[PDB]
Amino acid sequence: TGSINAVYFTNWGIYGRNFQPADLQASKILHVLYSFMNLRVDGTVYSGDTYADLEKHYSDDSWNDIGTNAYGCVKQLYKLKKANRSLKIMLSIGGWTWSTNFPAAASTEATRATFAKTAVEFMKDWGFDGIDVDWEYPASETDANNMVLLLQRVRQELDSYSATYANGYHFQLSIAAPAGPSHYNVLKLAQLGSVLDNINLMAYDYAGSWDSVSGHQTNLYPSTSNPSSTPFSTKAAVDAYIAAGVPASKIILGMPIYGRAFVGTDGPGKPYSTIGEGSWESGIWDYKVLPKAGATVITDSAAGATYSYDSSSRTMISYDTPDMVRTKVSYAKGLGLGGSMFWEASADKTGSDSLIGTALSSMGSHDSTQNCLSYPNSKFDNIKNSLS
């Protein structure tokens, strides 16, 4: 019953962004994509921040617990799982920055087995509900085939783990997927659709500093009036995936909780001086600070995009408004897509202007699939006891 509402939570969001797991709208999210784990060329998955993942003590945490115990974001997320049964926690591996070793990690039966075995080990120790593989991106036909083999080996490991320790609980397996044809045309889409529970389409980052002209970063449709503003489109991607034999219900529509800026520009599809400053890096702004004073919010209904434009500073910021999220959900419903996904949690507004909340309101009811609260093989005593 219901729709998927998947949200990236970054483990570095606990520093400088001061965004802790407890701040999530846990009752409005069915999948937390907990990001990221790193990996070696030999397939070994590992924590890139044990402090954030496991060791940080929140005000509730004791220093003198009996045995070996999990703290950090892991314990915090598990707390949320107990209180919100539709909340699945996914172990996200790789990502934009940590995809360099994927080709090698997927390359042999031995490396794929290591990746399986180490990934599931984290899942079963940390009390998570599945694995999300974010390989950006397979380059060759060999990589594409290896990706399928890797995912099948992970599926095998999840199934065997579950038969032994989870009474057949169906742990989940997903990927972050490209909306760029140069990348999705490499993938074995039909095979991916068969093996995976969900395919989270990264329907954003269509425009930025790498473009000669400003553009819409997350538009639904090609612009016929101003095509230089739309180098990509969600529609082309979704159509390609569905035509390939990917079940629409497994496709989850990614949406940005941030804006991409073009400073010193006449508007979409123009010349721009610089991407300018940002919230945490140049040219990217947290949704929660948009729109800025002096900027007007513009809707291009034909392209299916919103953006702010400030004509005095000649600054365009490409981002999704709540009413853009509503429009996108309506598009997704028409195609029978499985739900929504967001990058990333910390930047969202509160109350009704939350993009995460807006999406769920538009979607209707939340995915009823129950999480797992039984981890009898966890090396952490508190996790094995379900924090009871």
Ligand X SMILES: Cn1c(=O)c2c(ncn2C)n(C)c1=O
Count of residues touching ligand X (by CB under 6 A): 7
Task: Please select the residue that binds ligand X; options are 128, 343, 375, 380, rule is CB under 6 A.
Answer: 343
* Candidates 136, 157, 277, 344; catalytic one: 136
Cα-flanking dihedrals φ and ψ of residue 173, to 5°? Answer: -140, 125
Closest separation in Å from C-beta 287 to ligand X: 12
The pairing of strands 31-39 and 4-10 is parallel
The Cα 119–Cα 92 span in angstroms is 10
Give me 73's structure tokens. 């974001």
Residue ranges of alpha helices (H) inside 84-140 are: 102-105, 109-126
* Closer residue to ligand X in complex, CB, 10/378: 10
Q: How far is the CB of 208 from ligand X (least distance, A)?
A: 6
Which of 71/128 has CB closer to ligand X? Answer: 128
Q: How far is the CB of 60 from ligand X (least distance, A)?
A: 30
Least Å distance, CB 343 to ligand X, is 4
178 vs 303: CA distance, rounded Å: 20
Q: Which two tokens stand for residue 9?
A: 């939570």
Rounded to whole angstroms, the Cα distance separating 29 from 327 reads: 19
x-marked contacts with ligand X along 123-162 as a string, rule CB under 6 A? -----------x----------------------------
- Report in angstroms how near the CB of residue 207 gets to ligand X at its nearest: 9
Cβ at position 47, least distance to ligand X in Å: 16
Of residues 7-36, those binding ligand X (CB under 6 A): none
* 92 to 111: interface string for ligand X, x by CB under 6 A: ---xx---------------
Query: Does residue 176 bind ligand X (CB under 6 A)?
Result: yes
- CA distances in angstroms from 298 to 230, 278, 310, 343, listed in the order given: 16, 20, 10, 22
Q: Which residue is nearest to ligand X (CB)?
A: 95
Rounded to whole angstroms, the maximal C-alpha distance in the chain is 66
Following DSSP, what letter does each residue of 36-52 receive, concatenated? EEEE-TTS-EEES-HII
In the bound state with ligand X, the residue whose beta carbon lies nearer, of 137 and 375, is: 137
Helix (H, G, I), strand (E, B) or coil at 359: helix
Give me the 267-306 binding string for ligand X, x by CB under 6 A, dash otherwise: ----------------------------------------
C-alpha–C-alpha distance, residues 264 and 228, integer Å: 17
Is residue 141 among the annotated active site residues?
Answer: no
First to last CA, the chain: 29
Residue in 284, 261, 304, 283 with CA at minimum distance from that of residue 347:
284
Q: Which residues bind ligand X (CB under 6 A)?
A: 95-96, 134, 176, 202, 205, 343
Residues forming the active site: 136
